[PDB]
């Protein structure tokens, strides 16, 4: 079992924190917020680095490029912005979605960006030119998450419409629709680090590990509270193999991936833990919470 304990609490955002992500090189933590700002922090010591500003309304997601040099954010101003970490410059503003942008990610090569929106579409953008390459009529309700697979050949999307869908990056064809015997909103999805599974959250207090190629649910993770918000979930692979997620009872939940048992609950936040992230090489978890809390917390474990 892990032994995560609190090391740092990071105050700075003036509204709910919407996402936290460690840079692939392990150096930084990026946070986004309803306060319209992205903030960069030292991953190991929590030391504030810089604020990145530009969006006109709150931000729902931020993501790193594979080389840790760029970030992309999605906002209620209906744009995405591509940022250069070193300079803080907005290199491109991606305009095309007709409603709020909810989620975003680079592909492994960091030459494409995928985005999901309240306009019910998934869009694929060229990073270099900042132009919209494809618009997929993906869902019948807002798109809650989008993620590229290990080689970038596939995109997985999730939606409040209750569906998880797999898309061919090149053609834009819908290759698969995944759903279980109940039809609750799907609030989050991502491929596993090894690329052969997807982890999906639904708003019935349940996380599920799918073999997406076979279309079978392999594992379910329960114990947490999730009926309202699109809470991030993660694979922890640096020490023991865990599943990590936020919860609406104000705690971070950690499960054993294989046994599906709850192995730890991290207490400290004063509001719903909306976002969590796992560091790429060290046993470090970042967590952040909604309007009544406004803080980010860094937890560390020897296992």
């Amino acid at each position: 079992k892990p032994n995560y304990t609190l090391k740092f609490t990071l105050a700075g955002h003036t509204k709910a924190v919407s996402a936290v992500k460690f840079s692939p090189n392990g150096e930084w933590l990026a946070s986004s917020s309803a306060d319209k700002l992205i903030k960069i922090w030292g991953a190991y010591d929590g030391k504030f680095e810089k604020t990145i500003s530009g969006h006109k309304l709150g931000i729902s997601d931020v993501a790193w490029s594979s080389d840790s040099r760029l970030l992309v954010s999605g906002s209620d101003d209906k744009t995405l912005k591509v940022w250069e970490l070193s300079t803080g410059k907005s290199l491109k503003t991606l305009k095309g979605h007709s409603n709020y942008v909810f989620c975003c990610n680079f592909n492994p090569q960091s030459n494409l960006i995928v985005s999901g929106s309240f306009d019910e579409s998934v869009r694929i953008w060229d990073v270099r030119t900042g132009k919209c390459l494809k618009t997929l009529p993906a869902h019948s309700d807002p798109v809650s998450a989008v993620h590229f697979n290990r080689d970038g050949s596939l995109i997985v999307s999730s939606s409040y419409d209750g569906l998880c869908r797999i898309w061919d990056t090149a053609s834009g064809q819908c290759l698969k629709t995944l759903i279980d015997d109940d039809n609750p909103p799907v609030s989050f999805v991502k491929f596993s680090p090894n690329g052969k599974y997807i982890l999906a959250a639904t708003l019935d207090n349940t996380l599920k590990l799918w073999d997406y190629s076979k279309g079978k649910c392999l594992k379910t993770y329960t114990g947490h509270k999730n009926e309202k918000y699109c809470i991030f979930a993660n694979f922890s692979v640096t020490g023991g193999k865990w599943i990590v997620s936020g919860s609406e009872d104000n705690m971070v939940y950690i499960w054993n991936l294989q046994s599906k048992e709850v192995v730890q609950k991290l207490q400290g936040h004063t509001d719903t833990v909306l976002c969590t992230a796992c560091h790429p090489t060290e046993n470090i978890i970042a967590s952040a919470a909604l309007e009544n809390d406004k803080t980010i917390k860094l937890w560390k474990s020897d296992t």
């Binding site: 309803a34 931000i59 729902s60 709020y100 909810f102 807002p142 309202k228 918000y229």
Partner: peptide, 9 residues
Amino acid sequence: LCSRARPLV
């Protein structure tokens, strides 16, 4: 609040 910080309608 931004979209992710708004609860299920």
